[PDB]
Write a protein that binds this ligand. Structure first.
Ligand SMILES: O=C(COc1cccc(Br)c1)N[C@@H]1CC2CC2[C@@H]1O
Ligand SMILES: O=C(COc1cccc(Br)c1)N[C@@H]1C[C@@H]2CC2[C@@H]1O
Lengths: 161, 153
């Protein structure tokens, strides 16, 4: 975990974080960070291997105002699973439909709240065959993921700022 | 953890947190939150001599909380000035020899700490005690922070 601290740059650090989450069973990973009182999601510090087509479309669609994981991160420190039950509006249902077309079907989102008021997320998708296999998997690794998201926040807030 | 969230009042919430920390091997805990909300069984005299001696600005855990989200294990390694050693010797007198502080930074900007002491006979044994529960502790601190900020403010 503390390799994340050691890393020189965003580049090597980004490569460690992706090895680490891949090692755990995840396929697509997003680390995002904003400084305190900023809603400029379209311009956050972003690391990982999320499909760039999804990220650009998400930007243009204004999906930061729709993504249920985003309003959740601004109010909570606790994980949110990409369960069908977090997609509660016609817009969020449609947001899920497009995220699926990009392979972001099963996963979770750990909110990040740093010591300097930084706000962000560690999102990780898993490539599973049904909600039951996805959820059992994510609960196994949840306690390692719970430590990892804060090491990422601390070393990651360090490189960005 | 879920029962922490099911808690209707601050009193049953602290009872839960105290029992969980106790079941995990800690005997004295402080949960402090600023927007200060204080729960736990810390020696009431210690919280008092703390403020009195203005120890907030010599105690290494406090400076670390303002700057990190990672836990800091209590140790005279950071208590290396002579007052910082009196601070430890005094904390030792109150039973707070071994333990760790989890910093708390909530979604709406709350600032705080979850401190947990362990009774142990040496630093090796103490760190084993805390390392072995660290993943569970890491979840506890965030569950406590979310549910505790929602019931403190
Ligand atoms: O506990 C703490 C940290 O407390 C904080 C920090 C920041 C905001 C608020 Br609110 C509370 N420090 C000492 C470690 C040790 C022997 C003793 C004392 O517990
Ligand atoms: O992962 C995320 C974004 O998280 C955040 C939150 C707050 C601040 C910042 Br900066 C980033 N959203 C979706 C999860 C899922 C199926 C899809 C989407 O991509």
């Amino acid at each position: 975990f503390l390799e994340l601290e050691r890393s020189s740059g965003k580049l090597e650090w980004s490569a460690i974080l992706q090895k680490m989450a891949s090692d755990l069973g995840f396929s697509k990973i997003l680390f995002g960070l904003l400084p305190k009182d900023s809603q400029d999601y379209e311009n956050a510090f972003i690391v990982g291997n999320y499909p760039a087509a999804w990220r650009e479309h998400y930007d243009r669609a204004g999906y930061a105002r729709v993504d249920p994981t985003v309003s959740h991160c601004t109010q909570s420190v606790l994980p949110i699973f990409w369960e069908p039950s977090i997609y509660q509006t016609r817009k969020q249902h449609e947001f899920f439909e497009e995220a699926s077309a990009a392979g972001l079907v099963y996963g979770l989102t750990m909110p990040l709240h740093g010591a300097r008021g930084e706000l962000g997320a560690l999102s990780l998708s898993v490539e599973a065959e049904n909600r039951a296999e996805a959820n059992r998997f994510m609960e196994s690794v949840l306690p390692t993921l719970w430590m990892l998201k804060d090491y990422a926040l601390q070393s990651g807030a360090g490189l960005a700022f």
